[model samples]
Target: GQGGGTHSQWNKPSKPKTNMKHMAGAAAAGAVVGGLGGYMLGSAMSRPIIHFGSDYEDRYYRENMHRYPNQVYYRPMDEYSNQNNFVHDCVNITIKQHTVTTTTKGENFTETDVKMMERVVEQMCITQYERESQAYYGGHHHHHH
Candidate 1:
């Protein structure tokens, strides 16, 4: 009784070497492109984590929610960010998620793990989101999100 049902979150691309460096096709800038990127090239990142208000989880929620049913997906905890720390400073984040998903493997996570996956995957997204969010916060004052 082993159905695996493994979906695709991270799999090898067409080629191993093809996974590095690009612009037009590769979306090399972590998919932010000129939208939220390119602003930080001029100065240090302003806001650390927690977004400017919406950018942090909004983008992730829009892209998600459908993947795991419309049962409310993302919306991270405040602990991921604080006045003294930032998402960029996290070292053991991947550890939490990787292990957390395993909790589902044991049924302890139950359906709640899906939500956990949302948060954890958002953690990964925030890892990059933090980058672009920081870019948006740096010198830009548009307040789009």
Candidate 2:
């Protein structure tokens, strides 16, 4: 006969719970070597679309309004535009930068991540490449030297 319950099951966790808060304040890559069945752990993979122009505009405006911050060049927009040679070197100095870091406790999941990362990189590169090429093409039309 079993005596009243809660006796043997009363082992209540005998250790301090490791402090790990799901920090919303968190302000926050990689290569796979010869496959030998690894167990990598991370959700740490991140590749956000760059708002280069948008963010740059914000920074530029902020600096200009802040009295040039440290820049001493004070010239009208027209003067610079008229005399400035738009050096649009559409020359891509970057080549295949597909670095993928994936979180996994198994073998199958990582492969998916690799494919996902590759597709993402391809699309991203495509967009930027197309946008830059088109921009240069437009500028080149009038940039007869």
Candidate 3:
């Protein structure tokens, strides 16, 4: 003989409910923390390093050539015209200056800058020469009997 009764199976445990709202909010916070951490770590890295080469040597020479004018030289750009051609020996003087103005890293910037600076120095020297010549021949001379 057994008792007639319906017994519910209440021994098994139910799955825990996941809070979706909490999960999304926590994920956002985690992303913010991760971003901050990455930035801090990145900022701790080494500084950039720069290098110079033979081009820099050329740049240096070009920028300081006036300091050594005796070493400077020039050649005629229009060799044919200056030497032979030209309507009936009519000559046009065009000179090509040679300087160490090659460069790198920033294209031909140093080359152009050095050339401009050289032009300024050349103009200054010419002006000075003219002044000195006038002073000497115009009777304002202080040197040489």
Candidate number of the best TM-score: 2
Collision pairs in model 3: none
Ten residues in sequence with the least summed lDDT for candidate 2: 89-98
Task: Give candidate 1's whole-model lDDT.
Answer: 0.38
Clashes of 3: 0
lDDT of 3 by residue, 21-124 (tens): 63332211222222122211111122121123557756665545443332111121225534232211111111112232221112243455544444433343
What's the CA error at residue 39 for candidate 1, in Å?
22
lDDT of 3 at 125: 35
TM-score of each: 0.22, 0.27, 0.21
* Residue-pair clashes per candidate: 0, 0, 0
TM-score pick, better of 2 and 3: 2
Residue 119 C-alpha lDDT in model 1: 51
Model 1, residue 37: what's the lDDT? 22
**lDDT by candidate, in order shown:** 0.38, 0.31, 0.32
TM-score of 1: 0.22
> Which stretches in model 1 have alpha-carbon errors above 4 Å?
1-84, 87-89, 106-130, 142-145
C-alpha lDDT (0 to 100) for residue 75 of candidate 2: 16
Among all windows of 10 consecutive residues in model 1, the one with the lowest summed lDDT is 68-77
CA RMSD, predictions in order: 20.5, 18.2, 28.1
